[PDB]
Ligand binder design. Structure first.
Ligand SMILES: Nc1ncnc2c1ncn2[C@@H]1O[C@H](COP(=O)(O)OP(=O)(O)OP(=O)(O)O)[C@@H](O)[C@H]1O
Ligand SMILES: Nc1ncnc2c1ncn2[C@@H]1O[C@H](COP(=O)(O)OP(=O)(O)OP(=O)(O)O)[C@@H](O)[C@H]1O
Ligand SMILES: O=C([O-])C(=O)[O-]
Ligand SMILES: O=C([O-])C(=O)[O-]
Ligand SMILES: O=C([O-])C(=O)[O-]
Ligand SMILES: [Mg+2]
Ligand SMILES: [Mg+2]
Ligand SMILES: [Mg+2]
Ligand SMILES: [Mg+2]
Ligand SMILES: [Mg+2]
Ligand code: NA
Ligand code: NA
Ligand code: NA
Lengths: 519, 519, 519
């Protein structure tokens, strides 16, 4: 009984590949797919944060949607505190990224009967008037609804729908004025105060960044985050807007755009080009677009990013059930796996870690599935498809990347060691999707932490100073990776590994590739 | 914007195929995936049952693990009643299949406070006693739980873990008694009636066919079911025995082996060979085996049945969130869409329709996701991969099927019309997976009911009496199909369609293929 | 029992396909690739004609660059004589096409000693005078060499090179005047009559359609030729021009454009688009362009026509040897084979039949090699690729063809019988390259003759009156095929066949496909 789906790995067709999957075919210890965990009341503590890390947490996500700078900073604190607890063991030390998730643009209704707690009941088939007249900003009721978005009538059309409260309530536009909309309740319910609005199929003129947004980003810069997850991206311009706010001080910050609506989907191509990475924000996306289309968009986005060699994140409701239970649903297990099969660089946990009763279990779970799904990929076919995709480019690093992955397959390397500072070298490899783990040694901590954004990248921070001999310095770094994979159980002495390095100190890339034996 | 993902249909590569999936690409009216609904308390009603038919249900599932024969015979009548209510119009009548789900070698709980619909809430950390004392078999509660399995004590040990209800609840043995076990709730949860008990890693020697199984099966024959879903099939032998119990009288009833344990996976090959079809039974499966391995088994199984040309069903917890909510989760929408992509012939609903709060929704949602996933298939690679797999075969009807599918792809016909009595011809078409709808006109009722097990087959009962001239008869049936297609919105006058008929009466199969325009 | 490379037909890769070709794997009786024979002095005879047809000859080419209208008219005569000589038994009657090969924009020497059958030896180093002196026109010889081109002196420099007879002889201009050219013979060789002059890389302003061309054209129209090999076609305009001269009376004469220069190649596409088919005239072509590049043209050109669905011919020096030897060279046998594998619908013989010592042997040799090569094709992949190409198209007859061919493979049918009058349904099928024979039954003689242009089509001429009853009439025709197939030894009883017919009369195409057993 081969391991890691090697038997199916040898299939000629996709169909054969499937038919060959084996539950008895064990997968390697190394889990390539990054796990992004939203931190919160459930996970905030150091102790817990220690467990989250132990459990497989790679990225700590800061949902700026709620809480104060003072709160988040405290979370970041703890995170940093928890991470460092292992530093004492440079070998057993594991980098953990910090991400900032923007509240983003928002539409909100007014107060019901001047009360924040009151409710009304909209009944299907009834008429309801939307006004922009702040005269009613606190006089919302069964007949009149006031909202935050002054330009609404400009972007919505008669016959269009207005969704209130996470799509709970649906409204159909029957009449449009410059100051109001006359709608018809399709999907009734109780209406509370200050509920969210969604304008499915609308090309919303809200700014790329709210005022709050600007503030958080600056904050994130001051906090030294590793990336930013930018809510509500609808076009390249919006990405540019964010870039602009982070500016020169935060030019090294990774901007991940969140695809959450039709527009975003339709203008994905430009958005992708302008971004550093993508996040398939299923939550809103599923609210914005028909829930039955989400998958299409998910696979489209994943394929496109894989094609472009840009990091992609699958997020939202992956293990939903797990907020309350220690074991997920079958669909849940399915979802995580397909996600990984799709080509997703990272997978995410929101509610599950933030507030749920089983944060660690969610993490462990994700870890478990990802590993299995990872072996189950059809690498040969994939590499081949990818290569074709990129045929247009004759880049050297890529060539190095292609050659090295091909070799890792050929001799079934146990790992791929890449020495990089910027991490470009390592990114080039990950994109070609080896099956083996990519152990990347860098002296740049931020590069290290950011690596997580990429599939198969296992960052190892070199905390030593530079030697007078390049050669030696390189050898050392290599050895480091060697003690790690060993310490991690990725391999043992005798195993073979692909080693990538820069010929000289001003090489520019890992131009030197070598097949080597573990000590 | 092209329809039915036809742009992505032109993809050369799988990677490319994925990249071109467009949410703005609208599916067709026809939904190829059969929808199987478990009928129960929530769905038993004739009014309701009428609703579900309209919403899309193709097969009525009755679980003999719950209720009674009479409970079941009543439901069966209601389905039949509901169904025939449409028999009137020979163009809007939807054949609806009936299926019996066996108990098999399983361990089951008692009744909760004397009810088959009542439940109780367990509390993490609480103690719970399992009793064999038949005195409580109807008095199960939060303090005491009665089991089916009298030997339970010999096959368990202190510290052993007992799972209840597809792993929902985890009990850990604390105390062994001669008549009982004092357990501990390891996790909070709602305990319902007659729930499965799973003892992973325990010697449970139950027979493939129990005396009770004998009665249900015979009852199913008397009930004139169309197929049996055979729980916990473990070897071809089990299957043979079932066929044996159904004997001559129920020789035409379809046997669907349910895969839900290690053994069933392991001996899958021998199981498929002997069955009429398979079910991926995820509920039990995922608790028997590692939850993380499910998708593997799921995928292996579906490739295998696809390869084999035998009907496969994906089931359980597919729209799980919908038992309580009116919208499914993101993992849920994915699951369903991936099962279709995986190649499942039918998908299924359990608690969702049997006892949930939103039975019709659950249905329409499956329906929605299904048409979408359908269009998203990569038919060209698929077909190619299928052809290949059945290379060794040289069958005449296979030949007719492949040429039929092939040309349908080519001229993009609106459907394939197939004249069949055994349903053999149609099935052979469905295995080659065309995009278009297969409309199978038959005078044989069971065939028509039975057809739903096969992808894309929309069965049409020709009620007209056999014409004395082959030609007119054939023509007669074609018109019937032509009319249903038009009525059902499958196509319009001018559309092009592929027609499979016999040259002569008693030709044996559809050896006649023509491309015909709609009238 | 190995036959028709069926084992190789099952390879997954092009490599494995190769690796599996078995010499011991016997080919079927049916030779797919048409054999075109250049009818000359050596094959004019009725008695010789009889044996060649017998030998596998499907088409006769009458080269206008040689002879007089009268010599060619007799040849036709004899051709048709030896042909209908077989009209006795319509089961074994084999049609033969009559092809007019044009002069074109060419330079041609004159009569060697008023002969034309006369030859002359030229020694290396010797001297030869090119003259425009008509009084030598028919008096060429070792000393004196007359030519077609009165401007040649303007188009050539001293030191330059003059090619005679497809580059057979290299003449270097030593000195030139107004009237003549003074050259020294660069390589020895037999200089014959009405030879070809190639002034490679020289601005010849020849006209696309000589008045003589015109003359001949009109002549062949009266001759009732089925096709035309238009020599030296350089651009679509030339085609239209030939098309032009063919005018109405010959709106059905197939125009086969010959690519024998750098321009023809370069303007291939529009040429192709305008012409009914193409010939790869390597004799002239190989001297017009570097000898080392012809195979690139051949492959590009054969590939393109395949793609287009237009008949292509491989022509010139295939079995050169054989003009003097009874057995061809290794290189020549590879050539015919490779040409067949390339995709050529037809193959040609030139000197081999027209003047060679072993006309009959050469023919049979083509027959022999073709068969063997037809089997060696990788039908699987080829069909997929062919479809990849035709993918934009949704033509109905095309869908028929494809499904038909697809079926043919599946059930290893012994043949496909097509009933056609225009012949298109048959070409449509031919183009999809089935391994099996196409028995194309028609009541159109010209159709039957022209069918030889397309690969695998075996033309059968139905001589019987029309049936009042379509069915009978169709049947009959089908019967015809059956008998002929039987008589030809294509199949026996119980063999499977694919039947292509039209549902009704004037169906515009075969819309009805049926799988049948031989009677
Ligand atoms: N006929 C019925 N009467 C009462 N409750 C039912 C009935 N059918 C289903 N249910 C309820 O719905 C739940 C899920 O239905 P399902 O048919 O999938 O049962 P199950 O317990 O999961 O076992 P299986 O493994 O056999 O499917 C059952 O556990 C039971 O609580
Ligand atoms: N009608 C003919 N009469 C006599 N000899 C002929 C005749 N046709 C062909 N031949 C001889 O056969 C040789 C090869 O025949 P072919 O038809 O290929 O002519 P060619 O000169 O090579 O012209 P092309 O380029 O057109 O093929 C001719 O060059 C000629 O010597
Ligand atoms: O913002 C998100 O993550 C979402 O909507 O899923
Ligand atoms: O029995 C079933 O359907 C299951 O367990 O999924
Ligand atoms: O005419 C030809 O065949 C040639 O020139 O090769
Ligand atoms: Mg969001
Ligand atoms: Mg169940
Ligand atoms: Mg079960
Ligand atoms: Mg020529
Ligand atoms: Mg020649
Ligand atoms: Na956020
Ligand atoms: Na059951
Ligand atoms: Na010529």
């Amino acid at each position: 009984i081969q391991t890691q789906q090697l038997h199916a790995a040898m299939a000629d067709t996709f169909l054969e590949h499937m038919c060959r999957l084996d539950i008895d075919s064990a997968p390697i210890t190394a889990r390539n797919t990054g796990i992004i965990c939203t931190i919160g009341p459930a996970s905030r503590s150091v102790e817990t944060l220690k467990e989250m890390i132990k459990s497989g947490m790679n990225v700590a996500r800061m949902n700026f949607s709620h809480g104060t700078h003072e709160y988040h900073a405290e979370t970041i604190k703890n995170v940093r505190t928890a991470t460092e607890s292992f530093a004492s063991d440079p070998i057993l030390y594991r980098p953990v990224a910090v991400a900032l998730d923007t509240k983003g643009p928002e539409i909100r209704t007014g107060l019901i009967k001047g009360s924040g707690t009151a409710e009304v009941e909209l009944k299907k088939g009834a008429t309801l008037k939307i006004t922009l007249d702040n005269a009613y900003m606190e006089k919302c009721d069964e007949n009149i609804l006031w909202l935050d978005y002054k330009n609404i009538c400009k972007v919505v059309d008669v016959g269009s729908k207005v969704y209130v409260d996470d799509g709970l309530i649906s409204l159909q536009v029957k009449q449009k004025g410059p100051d109001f909309l006359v709608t018809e309740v399709e999907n009734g319910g109780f209406l509370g105060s200050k509920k969210g609005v969604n304008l499915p199929g609308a090309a919303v003129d809200l700014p790329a960044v709210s005022e709050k947004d600007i503030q958080d980003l600056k904050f994130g810069v001051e906090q030294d985050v590793d990336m930013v997850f930018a809510s509500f991206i609808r076009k390249a311009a919006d990405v540019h807007e964010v870039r602009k706010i982070l500016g020169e001080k935060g030019k090294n910050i990774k901007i991940i755009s969140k695809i959450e609506n039709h527009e975003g989907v339709r203008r994905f191509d430009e958005i992708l080009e302008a971004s550093d990475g993508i996040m398939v924000a299923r939550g809103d996306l599923g609210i914005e677009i028909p829930a039955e289309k989400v998958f299409l968009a998910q696979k489209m986005i994943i394929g496109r990013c894989n094609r472009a060699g840009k990091p992609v994140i699958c997020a939202t409701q992956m293990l939903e059930s797990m907020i309350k239970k220690p074991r997920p649903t079958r669909a849940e297990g399915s979802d995580v796996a397909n996600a990984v099969l799709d080509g997703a660089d990272c997978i995410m946990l929101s509610g599950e870690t933030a507030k749920g009763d089983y944060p660690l279990e969610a993490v462990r779970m994700q870890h478990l599935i990802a590993r299995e799904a990872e072996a189950a990929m059809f690498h040969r076919k994939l590499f081949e498809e990818l290569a074709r995709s990129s045929s247009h480019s004759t880049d050297l690093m890529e060539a190095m990347a292609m050659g090295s992955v091909e070799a890792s397959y050929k001799c079934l390397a146990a790992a791929l060691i890449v020495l990089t500072e910027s991490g470009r070298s390592a990114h080039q490899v990950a994109r070609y999707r080896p099956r083996a783990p990519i152990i990347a040694v860098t002296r740049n901590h931020q590069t290290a932490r950011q690596a997580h954004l990429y599939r198969g990248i296992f960052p190892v921070v070199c905390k030593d100073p530079v030697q007078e001999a390049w050669a030696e310095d390189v050898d050392l770094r290599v050895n480091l990776a060697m003690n790690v994979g060993k310490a991690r159980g990725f391999f043992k002495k005798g195993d073979v590994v692909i080693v990538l390095t820069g010929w000289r100190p001003g090489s520019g890339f890992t131009n030197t590739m070598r097949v080597v034996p573990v000590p």
